[PDB]
Write a protein that binds this ligand. Structure first.
Ligand code: Q7M
Length: 267
């Protein structure tokens, strides 16, 4: 793990609060004193006490992966603590939490441009990840974190987010991430509505396979809805690349004049 993750000295780490239960144990908020003496807020993921050797492997393997990325829209790994206890992964702090929860608290309270800003950020981090040959496989609004300036960053802590072919025979590529991105794009313009709500999973699979798609969110610009449908092409070879998605979003930020055109599943 130490090839990509720095071993932090625990005396440099202060715990301030428990802010959630994660999968391998709790997540906390705290501060990290860097070698240069600067102090930053961090999120601190603790490995649960009484962990098995395997959960350790997996807990840290997440840090091996994260430590390979250095990008403004990917969660930054500050380091790990393994030569003392509890075992920790320390990451940059994101004040406004998961994106889906955050947007649900603020239904219809942002401008279309603010929302596109969030989406641009996500698209840019994914462009980087796919450039490194990484397929995320769990790209979803709940795995996107958003900081106090509304900057969104890909993270990773699922039928509704998965492409038909990935569901069908585990064909996971960057194009299946692009499918998931279109779902994220729906989640954002919907302010955190569950994709396909509570439909039986069997019917989510079946409906999408027959050509049905999520409907446009309320007041959704045509441009963003068409982008969702492009992301949701049945033929994975026909989906945009992340680089094209970023380019499209950069255009809509330049001219909100394009966004003026406004638009149960649709076939
Ligand atoms: N508020 C924050 O700043 C939080 C924060 N940074 N984390 C947190 C801790 C660990 C992760 N881990 C990862 O993102 N792992 C990971 C694994 C594979 C790939 C990638 C990626 F590179 F980005 F593709 C990341 C993600 C997020 C949280 N996990 C939480 C879990 C539950 C509740 C709140 C949480 N808050 C936070």
């Amino acid at each position: 793990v130490h090839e990509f993750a720095k071993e932090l000295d625990a005396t440099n780490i202060s715990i301030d609060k428990v802010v959630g239960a994660g999968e391998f144990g709790e997540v906390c908020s705290g501060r990290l004193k860097l070698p240069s003496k600067k102090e930053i807020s961090v999120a601190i993921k603790t490995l649960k006490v009484g962990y098995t050797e395997k959960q350790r492997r997996d807990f840290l393997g997440e840090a091996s992966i994260m430590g390979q990325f250095d990008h403004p829209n990917i969660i930054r790994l500050e380091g790990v603590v393994t030569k003392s206890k509890p075992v920790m992964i320390v990451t940059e702090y994101m004040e406004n939490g998961s994106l889906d929860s955050f947007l649900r608290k603020h239904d219809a309270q942002f401008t279309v441009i603010q929302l596109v800003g969030m989406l641009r950020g996500i698209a840019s981090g994914m462009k980087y990840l796919s450039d490194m040959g990484y397929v995320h496989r769990d790209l979803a609004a709940r795995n996107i974190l958003i900081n106090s300036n509304l900057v969104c960053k890909v993270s990773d802590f699922p039928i509704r987010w998965t492409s038909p072919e990935a569901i069908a025979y585990r064909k996971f590529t960057s194009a299946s991430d692009v499918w998931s991105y279109g779902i994220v794009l729906w989640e954002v313009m919907s302010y955190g509505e569950r994709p396909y709500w509570e439909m039986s999973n069997q019917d989510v699979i079946k409906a999408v396979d027959e050509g049905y798609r999520l409907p446009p969110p309320m007041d959704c610009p045509a441009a963003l809805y068409q982008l969702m449908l492009d992301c949701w092409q049945k033929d994975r070879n026909n989906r945009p690349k992340f680089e094209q998605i970023v380019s499209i979003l950069d255009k809509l930020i330049r001219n909100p004049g394009s966004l003026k055109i406004i638009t149960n599943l649709l076939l």
